[PDB]
Amino acid sequence: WIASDEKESLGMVTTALAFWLRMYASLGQASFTHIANVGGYEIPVTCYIEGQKSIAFQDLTTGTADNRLFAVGLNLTVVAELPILAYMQQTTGTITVKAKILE
Amino acid sequence: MILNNQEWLLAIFKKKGLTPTGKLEFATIDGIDSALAQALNEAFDSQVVSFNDRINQSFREFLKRTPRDRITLGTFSDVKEWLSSFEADRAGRKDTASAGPVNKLAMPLVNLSRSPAFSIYEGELCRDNYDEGHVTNENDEIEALVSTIPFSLEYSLWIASDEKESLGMVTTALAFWLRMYASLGQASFTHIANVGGYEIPVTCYIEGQKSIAFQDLTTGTADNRLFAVGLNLTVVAELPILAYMQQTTGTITVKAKILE
Amino acid sequence: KFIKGRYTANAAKGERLVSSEFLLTFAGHEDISVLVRTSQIPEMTREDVEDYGPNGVKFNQHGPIRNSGEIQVQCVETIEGDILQFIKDRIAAKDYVDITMAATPESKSSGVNAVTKAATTIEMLDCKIYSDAIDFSTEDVTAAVRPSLRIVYNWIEWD
Amino acid sequence: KFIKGRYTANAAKGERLVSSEFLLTFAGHEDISVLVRTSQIPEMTREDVEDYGPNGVKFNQHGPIRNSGEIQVQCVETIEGDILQFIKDRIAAKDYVDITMAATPESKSSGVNAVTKAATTIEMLDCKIYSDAIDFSTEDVTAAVRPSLRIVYNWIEWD
Amino acid sequence: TPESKSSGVNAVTKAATTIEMLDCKIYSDAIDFSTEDVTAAVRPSLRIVYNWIEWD
């Protein structure tokens, strides 16, 4: 949600957001990694914004007949690959190779 | 021929290096509205009426008026709201050509408004362009690289009048201006935006220019005897954004050699 | 506001053409140009010659120009039998006509630049005009009769 | 919170490309690159030699590389007749141009890895550019004219 | 199947679902790049020629 008093500031903020979102999609620009401390280990979590290039703003104010306030909304979806780990126990062994003549 | 041992020195050139900085600069969509408001006036200009008549009086008076008196700006939800705001704040006849009694509430009027919410184009007409041009100093240097992103904005036009004939004349003039000569750009305007210390032109187009359809806005003449018609328009503008740059010089040398 | 420098752009910028405006003269039969609704521009291609070198390498080479071809045109019919009489006259007497195709209606008499006008136009010489079957049926009251024309050109000229 | 160990992964992780960004240079005609809207990457295949052994066993064997092929490009037309003049010039004079297809817009000068740039780009040498028929019609006021181009490459280079 | 849990209750139900191809050749087809579809992702299409089939 973005709100402002004058319309020009709202336009500037929205234009800055749009320029950040759309430009340079192939080279990762709007994409972030969150480091999650799972157990005693640090595992990175990569998050992406689905449908990054498609941008459309929705109006949220009936008019300036009550408060003189401008509001505009946007909806986003974030895709994150959560990691899950299963504990294991390690043991050691040996493998031997032999060659033999039949009969 | 500069020849030492078995190698030739052929040429020495000069190069221009560019190293970027994080800073960015971009234009504003504020001037597009003024550009469109100015561009609309050329539809009514260059129109004449050969023979005077009682029906033609209002249209001729409207044609004689200045751009400030023809069009008013502001967003409204209802026609009654627009009329009440026009009445509350003095307007309509700022430029007077007669000192006698005049009527401030001229009947034919046009309103223009746009919605705060917008969107990127995402269509066929336009495409993202990276490094379309460069910006130079008074010297032979380069300061920034310019790229554009299409922007789609929504507009709505309201036309109102007292008699129906004047409304019909205004709407017919607008339709004639809009539809004719699409291939040779007729309804298309350029707004010059001073981004930083440099002047970069912004070209705006009307999407779906040929398709015109008017909508009625009045239930009937049972209350106020007023006629209103609306129209919706979309404008596609390629705003430029520039990334500041740093320039350095260097040289390139070319040599030929005999192996082993 | 200080004018530090100048802006220059190295890309082609211009408004996009609309395909809803065009013209088709049909040589000395200029009164038919109103009834057309669909036209095309010729193929504008060339033949290719295939060769196989040593081992399996392959090369495509420019060949002779393609002169004659086929184009499809759709028009509408009026009560006076305009298109029908036109086709009857064309079939009755062997003749070749010249068709001029333009992507713009007509340049305004300002005449700022003529190059942008000759760039979009094209001309076909020594053409033959035939027709296809025409469909008549009830159950579609609002429909209109649409003759379909097949035009064979024999040379392409520009500028 | 104690750092007991380190995490290592043996899988490919990275952002996925979006096909909405690409570049198409056309050698010395750089101003045309803005008008393109659809392109492709060459086939990248190889011939197969077919053999039958004893009984019914069968083997497919690598063959010679495929050099030449076709690719389809769709572009948009402006008022000034840029694409029409380009095609007219190409037909008038036989010549071969070089096309550099890239899957990314451009690498920022802060970019520190080059192989990720050479991996996506491809180059086609000694190419022939032709056109197809172009459709003009009324009844579609909002449509824009879309020339369709057919390009024949002769060699493929990378890295 | 994704994999067998390291419990390993039965093995014949694992070799039953798997298959192996030997001496294969990998080629590619044309790849489509276009605008007007901003949310799409590039999908290379691969053609693979196997020469023998093994199971169990």
Short mmCIF file of N, CA, C and O in Angstrom, two decimals, chain B residues 56-155:
data_model
loop_
_atom_site.label_atom_id
_atom_site.label_comp_id
_atom_site.label_asym_id
_atom_site.label_seq_id
_atom_site.Cartn_x
_atom_site.Cartn_y
_atom_site.Cartn_z
N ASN B 56 -25.87 27.74 -34.68
CA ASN B 56 -24.41 27.76 -34.69
C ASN B 56 -23.81 28.74 -33.69
O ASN B 56 -22.58 28.82 -33.60
N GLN B 57 -24.64 29.49 -32.96
CA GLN B 57 -24.11 30.55 -32.11
C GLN B 57 -23.20 29.99 -31.01
O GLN B 57 -22.08 30.47 -30.82
N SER B 58 -23.68 28.98 -30.29
CA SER B 58 -22.92 28.45 -29.17
C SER B 58 -21.61 27.82 -29.63
O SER B 58 -20.57 28.00 -28.98
N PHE B 59 -21.64 27.09 -30.74
CA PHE B 59 -20.42 26.47 -31.25
C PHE B 59 -19.39 27.51 -31.67
O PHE B 59 -18.20 27.36 -31.39
N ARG B 60 -19.83 28.58 -32.34
CA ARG B 60 -18.91 29.63 -32.73
C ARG B 60 -18.32 30.33 -31.51
O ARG B 60 -17.11 30.60 -31.46
N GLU B 61 -19.15 30.61 -30.50
CA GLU B 61 -18.64 31.22 -29.28
C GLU B 61 -17.62 30.32 -28.60
O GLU B 61 -16.60 30.79 -28.10
N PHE B 62 -17.89 29.01 -28.57
CA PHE B 62 -16.94 28.07 -28.00
C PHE B 62 -15.63 28.07 -28.78
O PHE B 62 -14.54 28.01 -28.18
N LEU B 63 -15.71 28.12 -30.11
CA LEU B 63 -14.50 28.13 -30.92
C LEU B 63 -13.67 29.39 -30.68
O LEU B 63 -12.44 29.34 -30.76
N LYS B 64 -14.33 30.52 -30.40
CA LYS B 64 -13.58 31.76 -30.19
C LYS B 64 -12.87 31.82 -28.84
O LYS B 64 -12.03 32.70 -28.65
N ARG B 65 -13.17 30.91 -27.92
CA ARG B 65 -12.64 31.01 -26.57
C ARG B 65 -11.19 30.52 -26.49
O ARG B 65 -10.72 29.76 -27.34
N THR B 66 -10.50 30.96 -25.45
CA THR B 66 -9.11 30.60 -25.20
C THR B 66 -9.00 29.19 -24.62
O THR B 66 -9.98 28.65 -24.10
N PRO B 67 -7.82 28.57 -24.71
CA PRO B 67 -7.68 27.20 -24.18
C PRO B 67 -8.03 27.06 -22.71
O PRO B 67 -8.58 26.03 -22.30
N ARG B 68 -7.73 28.08 -21.89
CA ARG B 68 -8.04 27.99 -20.47
C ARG B 68 -9.54 27.92 -20.22
O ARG B 68 -9.98 27.27 -19.26
N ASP B 69 -10.33 28.58 -21.06
CA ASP B 69 -11.78 28.62 -20.85
C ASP B 69 -12.48 27.38 -21.39
O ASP B 69 -13.57 27.03 -20.92
N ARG B 70 -11.89 26.70 -22.38
CA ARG B 70 -12.54 25.53 -22.96
C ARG B 70 -12.47 24.32 -22.03
O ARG B 70 -13.46 23.59 -21.87
N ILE B 71 -11.32 24.09 -21.40
CA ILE B 71 -11.04 22.85 -20.69
C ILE B 71 -10.77 23.14 -19.22
O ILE B 71 -10.08 24.11 -18.89
N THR B 72 -11.32 22.30 -18.35
CA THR B 72 -11.05 22.34 -16.92
C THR B 72 -10.45 21.00 -16.49
O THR B 72 -10.76 19.96 -17.07
N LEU B 73 -9.60 21.04 -15.48
CA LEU B 73 -8.89 19.86 -14.99
C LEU B 73 -9.37 19.49 -13.60
O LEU B 73 -9.71 20.37 -12.79
N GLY B 74 -9.41 18.20 -13.32
CA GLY B 74 -9.81 17.69 -12.02
C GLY B 74 -10.58 16.39 -12.19
O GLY B 74 -11.25 16.15 -13.19
N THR B 75 -10.49 15.54 -11.18
CA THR B 75 -11.18 14.25 -11.17
C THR B 75 -12.45 14.35 -10.34
O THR B 75 -12.45 14.98 -9.27
N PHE B 76 -13.53 13.75 -10.83
CA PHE B 76 -14.82 13.80 -10.18
C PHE B 76 -15.50 12.44 -10.31
O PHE B 76 -15.16 11.64 -11.17
N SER B 77 -16.47 12.21 -9.43
CA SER B 77 -17.24 10.97 -9.47
C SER B 77 -18.58 11.13 -10.17
O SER B 77 -19.12 10.15 -10.69
N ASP B 78 -19.13 12.34 -10.20
CA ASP B 78 -20.44 12.58 -10.78
C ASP B 78 -20.44 13.91 -11.52
O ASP B 78 -19.62 14.79 -11.26
N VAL B 79 -21.38 14.04 -12.46
CA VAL B 79 -21.52 15.28 -13.21
C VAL B 79 -21.96 16.41 -12.28
O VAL B 79 -21.50 17.55 -12.40
N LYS B 80 -22.86 16.10 -11.35
CA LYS B 80 -23.32 17.11 -10.40
C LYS B 80 -22.16 17.65 -9.57
O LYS B 80 -22.11 18.85 -9.28
N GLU B 81 -21.23 16.78 -9.18
CA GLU B 81 -20.05 17.23 -8.46
C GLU B 81 -19.23 18.20 -9.30
O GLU B 81 -18.75 19.22 -8.79
N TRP B 82 -19.04 17.89 -10.58
CA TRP B 82 -18.28 18.77 -11.46
C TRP B 82 -18.94 20.13 -11.59
O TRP B 82 -18.28 21.17 -11.50
N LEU B 83 -20.26 20.14 -11.79
CA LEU B 83 -20.97 21.41 -11.92
C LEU B 83 -20.92 22.21 -10.62
O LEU B 83 -20.73 23.43 -10.65
N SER B 84 -21.07 21.54 -9.48
CA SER B 84 -21.02 22.24 -8.20
C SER B 84 -19.64 22.83 -7.94
O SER B 84 -19.52 23.94 -7.41
N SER B 85 -18.58 22.09 -8.29
CA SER B 85 -17.24 22.63 -8.12
C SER B 85 -16.98 23.79 -9.07
O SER B 85 -16.32 24.77 -8.70
N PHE B 86 -17.48 23.70 -10.30
CA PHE B 86 -17.34 24.81 -11.25
C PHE B 86 -18.06 26.05 -10.75
O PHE B 86 -17.60 27.18 -10.96
N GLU B 87 -19.22 25.86 -10.11
CA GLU B 87 -19.97 27.00 -9.60
C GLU B 87 -19.32 27.59 -8.35
O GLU B 87 -19.26 28.82 -8.20
N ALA B 88 -18.83 26.74 -7.45
CA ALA B 88 -18.29 27.22 -6.18
C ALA B 88 -17.03 28.06 -6.38
O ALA B 88 -16.87 29.09 -5.73
N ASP B 89 -16.14 27.63 -7.27
CA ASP B 89 -14.91 28.35 -7.56
C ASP B 89 -15.07 29.09 -8.88
O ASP B 89 -15.39 28.48 -9.90
N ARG B 90 -14.84 30.40 -8.85
CA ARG B 90 -15.08 31.23 -10.02
C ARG B 90 -14.20 30.79 -11.18
O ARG B 90 -12.98 30.67 -11.04
N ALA B 91 -14.82 30.56 -12.34
CA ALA B 91 -14.11 30.12 -13.53
C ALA B 91 -15.08 30.21 -14.71
O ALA B 91 -16.28 30.44 -14.54
N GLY B 92 -14.53 30.02 -15.91
CA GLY B 92 -15.31 29.90 -17.13
C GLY B 92 -15.11 31.03 -18.11
O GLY B 92 -15.08 30.79 -19.32
N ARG B 93 -14.98 32.26 -17.62
CA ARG B 93 -14.88 33.45 -18.47
C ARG B 93 -13.75 34.34 -18.00
O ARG B 93 -13.90 35.55 -17.81
N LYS B 94 -12.57 33.74 -17.77
CA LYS B 94 -11.43 34.51 -17.30
C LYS B 94 -11.00 35.55 -18.32
O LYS B 94 -10.67 36.69 -17.96
N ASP B 95 -10.99 35.18 -19.60
CA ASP B 95 -10.59 36.08 -20.68
C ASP B 95 -11.85 36.66 -21.31
O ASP B 95 -12.52 35.98 -22.10
N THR B 96 -12.16 37.91 -20.98
CA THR B 96 -13.37 38.57 -21.44
C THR B 96 -13.05 39.53 -22.57
O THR B 96 -12.10 40.31 -22.49
N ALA B 97 -13.86 39.47 -23.63
CA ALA B 97 -13.71 40.36 -24.78
C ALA B 97 -14.76 41.46 -24.81
O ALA B 97 -14.72 42.31 -25.71
N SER B 98 -15.70 41.47 -23.87
CA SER B 98 -16.73 42.50 -23.80
C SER B 98 -16.88 42.95 -22.35
O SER B 98 -16.82 42.13 -21.43
N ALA B 99 -17.09 44.25 -22.16
CA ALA B 99 -17.25 44.81 -20.82
C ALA B 99 -18.68 44.75 -20.32
O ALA B 99 -18.92 45.09 -19.15
N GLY B 100 -19.64 44.33 -21.15
CA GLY B 100 -21.02 44.27 -20.74
C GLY B 100 -21.31 43.03 -19.91
O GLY B 100 -20.41 42.29 -19.50
N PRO B 101 -22.59 42.81 -19.64
CA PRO B 101 -22.98 41.63 -18.87
C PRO B 101 -22.67 40.35 -19.63
O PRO B 101 -22.96 40.23 -20.82
N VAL B 102 -22.08 39.39 -18.92
CA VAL B 102 -21.75 38.08 -19.49
C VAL B 102 -22.17 37.01 -18.50
O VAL B 102 -22.41 37.27 -17.32
N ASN B 103 -22.27 35.78 -19.00
CA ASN B 103 -22.65 34.63 -18.20
C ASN B 103 -21.40 33.80 -17.92
O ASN B 103 -20.76 33.30 -18.85
N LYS B 104 -21.06 33.65 -16.64
CA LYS B 104 -19.89 32.87 -16.27
C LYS B 104 -20.10 31.38 -16.54
O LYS B 104 -19.13 30.66 -16.79
N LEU B 105 -21.34 30.91 -16.50
CA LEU B 105 -21.65 29.50 -16.69
C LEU B 105 -21.94 29.23 -18.16
O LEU B 105 -23.08 29.00 -18.58
N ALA B 106 -20.88 29.25 -18.96
CA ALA B 106 -21.00 28.88 -20.36
C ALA B 106 -21.40 27.41 -20.47
O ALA B 106 -20.91 26.56 -19.71
N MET B 107 -22.29 27.11 -21.41
CA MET B 107 -22.87 25.77 -21.44
C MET B 107 -21.89 24.72 -21.97
O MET B 107 -21.69 23.70 -21.28
N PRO B 108 -21.26 24.88 -23.13
CA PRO B 108 -20.33 23.83 -23.60
C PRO B 108 -19.02 23.87 -22.83
O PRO B 108 -18.32 24.89 -22.82
N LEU B 109 -18.69 22.76 -22.18
CA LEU B 109 -17.46 22.64 -21.41
C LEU B 109 -16.90 21.23 -21.56
O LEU B 109 -17.64 20.28 -21.84
N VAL B 110 -15.59 21.10 -21.36
CA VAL B 110 -14.89 19.83 -21.47
C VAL B 110 -14.03 19.65 -20.23
O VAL B 110 -13.36 20.58 -19.79
N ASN B 111 -14.06 18.45 -19.66
CA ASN B 111 -13.28 18.11 -18.48
C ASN B 111 -12.34 16.96 -18.79
O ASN B 111 -12.68 16.06 -19.57
N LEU B 112 -11.15 16.99 -18.19
CA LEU B 112 -10.15 15.94 -18.34
C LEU B 112 -9.63 15.53 -16.98
O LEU B 112 -9.36 16.37 -16.12
N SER B 113 -9.47 14.22 -16.79
CA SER B 113 -8.97 13.68 -15.53
C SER B 113 -8.24 12.37 -15.81
O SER B 113 -8.44 11.73 -16.84
N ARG B 114 -7.39 11.98 -14.87
CA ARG B 114 -6.64 10.74 -14.97
C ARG B 114 -6.59 10.06 -13.61
O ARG B 114 -6.70 10.71 -12.57
N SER B 115 -6.42 8.74 -13.64
CA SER B 115 -6.42 7.96 -12.41
C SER B 115 -5.01 7.85 -11.85
O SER B 115 -4.05 7.70 -12.61
N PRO B 116 -4.85 7.93 -10.52
CA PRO B 116 -3.52 7.77 -9.93
C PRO B 116 -2.88 6.42 -10.23
O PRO B 116 -1.65 6.34 -10.37
N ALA B 117 -3.67 5.36 -10.33
CA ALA B 117 -3.14 4.04 -10.63
C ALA B 117 -2.86 3.89 -12.12
O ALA B 117 -3.64 4.33 -12.97
N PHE B 118 -1.74 3.25 -12.43
CA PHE B 118 -1.34 3.00 -13.81
C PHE B 118 -0.71 1.62 -13.88
O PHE B 118 -0.74 0.85 -12.92
N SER B 119 -0.13 1.30 -15.04
CA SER B 119 0.49 0.00 -15.24
C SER B 119 1.47 0.10 -16.39
O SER B 119 1.47 1.06 -17.16
N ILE B 120 2.33 -0.91 -16.50
CA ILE B 120 3.22 -1.02 -17.65
C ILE B 120 2.45 -1.62 -18.83
O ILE B 120 1.45 -2.31 -18.66
N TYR B 121 2.94 -1.33 -20.04
CA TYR B 121 2.17 -1.62 -21.25
C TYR B 121 1.87 -3.10 -21.39
O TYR B 121 0.70 -3.52 -21.31
N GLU B 122 2.90 -3.92 -21.60
CA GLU B 122 2.75 -5.37 -21.77
C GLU B 122 1.82 -5.68 -22.95
O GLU B 122 0.70 -6.17 -22.79
N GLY B 123 2.31 -5.35 -24.13
CA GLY B 123 1.57 -5.56 -25.36
C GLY B 123 2.50 -5.74 -26.54
O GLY B 123 3.62 -6.23 -26.39
N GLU B 124 2.03 -5.32 -27.71
CA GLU B 124 2.77 -5.45 -28.96
C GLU B 124 3.41 -4.16 -29.43
O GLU B 124 4.49 -4.18 -30.03
N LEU B 125 2.77 -3.02 -29.16
CA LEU B 125 3.18 -1.76 -29.78
C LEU B 125 4.59 -1.36 -29.38
O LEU B 125 5.38 -0.92 -30.22
N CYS B 126 4.94 -1.51 -28.10
CA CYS B 126 6.21 -1.03 -27.59
C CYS B 126 6.99 -2.15 -26.92
O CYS B 126 6.44 -3.19 -26.55
N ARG B 127 8.29 -1.92 -26.75
CA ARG B 127 9.20 -2.88 -26.17
C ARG B 127 10.25 -2.14 -25.35
O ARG B 127 10.57 -0.99 -25.63
N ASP B 128 10.77 -2.82 -24.33
CA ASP B 128 11.82 -2.23 -23.51
C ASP B 128 13.08 -2.02 -24.34
O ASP B 128 13.49 -2.89 -25.12
N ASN B 129 13.71 -0.86 -24.17
CA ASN B 129 14.93 -0.52 -24.88
C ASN B 129 16.01 -0.16 -23.87
O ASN B 129 15.79 0.68 -23.00
N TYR B 130 17.17 -0.80 -23.99
CA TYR B 130 18.29 -0.57 -23.10
C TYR B 130 19.40 0.13 -23.86
O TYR B 130 19.79 -0.31 -24.95
N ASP B 131 19.91 1.23 -23.30
CA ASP B 131 20.99 2.01 -23.89
C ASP B 131 20.62 2.48 -25.30
O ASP B 131 21.33 2.23 -26.27
N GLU B 132 19.48 3.17 -25.40
CA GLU B 132 19.05 3.68 -26.69
C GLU B 132 19.89 4.86 -27.13
O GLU B 132 19.99 5.13 -28.33
N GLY B 133 20.49 5.58 -26.18
CA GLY B 133 21.29 6.74 -26.51
C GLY B 133 22.21 7.10 -25.36
O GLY B 133 22.20 6.46 -24.30
N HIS B 134 23.00 8.14 -25.58
CA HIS B 134 23.98 8.60 -24.60
C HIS B 134 23.91 10.11 -24.49
O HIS B 134 23.44 10.80 -25.40
N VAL B 135 24.39 10.63 -23.36
CA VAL B 135 24.31 12.04 -23.03
C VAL B 135 25.73 12.59 -22.94
O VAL B 135 26.57 12.05 -22.21
N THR B 136 25.99 13.68 -23.66
CA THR B 136 27.32 14.26 -23.76
C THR B 136 27.37 15.62 -23.08
O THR B 136 26.36 16.28 -22.88
N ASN B 137 28.59 16.03 -22.73
CA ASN B 137 28.84 17.32 -22.11
C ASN B 137 29.05 18.39 -23.18
O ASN B 137 28.90 18.15 -24.38
N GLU B 138 29.40 19.60 -22.73
CA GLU B 138 29.86 20.61 -23.67
C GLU B 138 31.17 20.19 -24.31
O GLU B 138 31.48 20.60 -25.44
N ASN B 139 31.96 19.38 -23.61
CA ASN B 139 33.15 18.77 -24.16
C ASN B 139 32.80 17.45 -24.84
O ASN B 139 31.64 17.02 -24.87
N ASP B 140 33.82 16.80 -25.39
CA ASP B 140 33.64 15.49 -26.02
C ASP B 140 33.75 14.42 -24.95
O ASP B 140 34.77 13.74 -24.82
N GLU B 141 32.69 14.27 -24.16
CA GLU B 141 32.63 13.27 -23.11
C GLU B 141 31.23 12.68 -23.07
O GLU B 141 30.31 13.19 -23.71
N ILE B 142 31.07 11.60 -22.31
CA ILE B 142 29.78 10.94 -22.13
C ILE B 142 29.51 10.84 -20.64
O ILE B 142 30.38 10.42 -19.87
N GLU B 143 28.31 11.24 -20.23
CA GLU B 143 27.95 11.29 -18.82
C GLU B 143 26.93 10.25 -18.39
O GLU B 143 26.91 9.87 -17.22
N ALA B 144 26.07 9.78 -19.30
CA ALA B 144 25.02 8.85 -18.92
C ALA B 144 24.56 8.07 -20.14
O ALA B 144 24.84 8.45 -21.28
N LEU B 145 23.86 6.97 -19.88
CA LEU B 145 23.23 6.16 -20.91
C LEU B 145 21.74 6.12 -20.65
O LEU B 145 21.31 5.90 -19.51
N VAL B 146 20.94 6.32 -21.69
CA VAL B 146 19.50 6.52 -21.57
C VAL B 146 18.78 5.26 -22.03
O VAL B 146 19.10 4.71 -23.09
N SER B 147 17.81 4.81 -21.24
CA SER B 147 16.96 3.69 -21.58
C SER B 147 15.52 4.04 -21.23
O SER B 147 15.26 4.89 -20.38
N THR B 148 14.58 3.37 -21.89
CA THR B 148 13.16 3.70 -21.78
C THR B 148 12.34 2.48 -21.39
O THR B 148 12.67 1.35 -21.72
N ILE B 149 11.25 2.75 -20.67
CA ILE B 149 10.28 1.73 -20.27
C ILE B 149 8.88 2.25 -20.59
O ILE B 149 8.53 3.36 -20.16
N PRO B 150 8.06 1.51 -21.34
CA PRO B 150 6.72 2.00 -21.66
C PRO B 150 5.84 2.11 -20.42
O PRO B 150 5.96 1.34 -19.47
N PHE B 151 4.94 3.10 -20.45
CA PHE B 151 4.02 3.36 -19.36
C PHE B 151 2.64 3.64 -19.94
O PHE B 151 2.51 4.40 -20.90
N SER B 152 1.62 3.03 -19.35
CA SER B 152 0.24 3.20 -19.81
C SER B 152 -0.55 3.95 -18.76
O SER B 152 -0.55 3.58 -17.58
N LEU B 153 -1.24 5.01 -19.18
CA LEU B 153 -2.02 5.86 -18.29
C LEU B 153 -3.45 5.93 -18.79
O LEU B 153 -3.70 5.85 -20.00
N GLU B 154 -4.39 6.10 -17.86
CA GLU B 154 -5.81 6.09 -18.17
C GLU B 154 -6.39 7.49 -18.02
O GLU B 154 -6.15 8.15 -17.00
N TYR B 155 -7.14 7.93 -19.02
CA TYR B 155 -7.75 9.25 -19.03
C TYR B 155 -9.23 9.13 -19.36
O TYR B 155 -9.66 8.16 -19.99
#
